[PDB]
């Protein structure tokens, strides 16, 4: 049951076998303190690597989910999939998002600013 196990193993594979870790992250899905994990990944910055699982669990519509996908798009500078995502759920503010976009240098994305 206890979950510190998960954190220890993932920290290890991160340190040792992230190639062997990604898959596992999927395999350990149902019972999870997902947000603590994502905070840890923020700490380790390698969230973009674990992106597959992220897009997997995207359904649950958590603030963590939001900000994760949002920063991944910011770094990514995609809009199409970004449009899909932002339309997919609602559990997040957009003020700071508008602040990001207003200087996005891309009216295409600033169009999305106007949209939100």
């Amino acid at each position: 049951a206890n979950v510190e196990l998960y954190y220890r193993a993932i920290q290890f594979y991160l340190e040792f076998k992230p190639l062997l870790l990604n898959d596992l992250l999927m395999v350990l899905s149902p019972r999870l303190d997902h947000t603590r994990a994502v905070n840890y990944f923020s700490k380790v910055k390698q969230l973009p690597l674990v992106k597959p699982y992220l897009r997997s669990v995207q359904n649950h519509n958590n603030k963590s989910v939001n900000e994760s996908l949002n920063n991944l798009f910011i770094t990514e500078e995609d809009y199409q999939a970004l449009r899909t995502s932002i339309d997919a759920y609602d559990n997040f503010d957009n003020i700071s998002l508008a602040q990001r976009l207003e200087k996005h240098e891309l009216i295409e994305f600033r169009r999305i600013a106007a949209y939100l």
Partner: protein, 116 residues
């Protein structure tokens, strides 16, 4: 004989058949160091049969009456929670939230978010 050397799952089976909360209080009196391994066996074995909540109720009575505190019962709560024969709420989620109160831990949020 059991604590001496055994896989106490069978002992539970005796309990989960012989409905005697006083027999638990005998088992459950905290001066036995081996009280930990046996409860570690019950936190998965007791759930195996899952026919009717009789011994369930009886053992949670034993818990609260012997004051099995947080870090001990909530185990039972969450484990019987996830995808059991019992999707109903016969004080189930209610003592769940009571334990949430006695716990005051972020877990309460997602618990709600799964509660219905």
């Amino acid at each position: 004989v059991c604590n001496e050397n055994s896989l106490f799952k069978s002992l539970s089976r005796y309990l989960v058949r012989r409905k005697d909360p006083e027999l638990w209080g005998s088992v459950l009196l905290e001066s036995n160091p081996y009280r930990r391994p046996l409860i570690d066996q019950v936190v998965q074995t007791a759930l195996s049969e899952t026919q009717d909540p009789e011994e369930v109720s009886v053992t949670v009575k034993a818990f609260m009456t012997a004051d099995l505190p947080n870090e001990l019962i909530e185990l039972l709560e969450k484990i019987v929670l996830d995808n059991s024969v019992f999707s109903e709420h016969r004080n189930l989620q209610n003592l769940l939230i009571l334990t949430a109160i006695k716990a005051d831990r972020t877990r309460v949020m997602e618990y709600i978010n799964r509660l219905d």
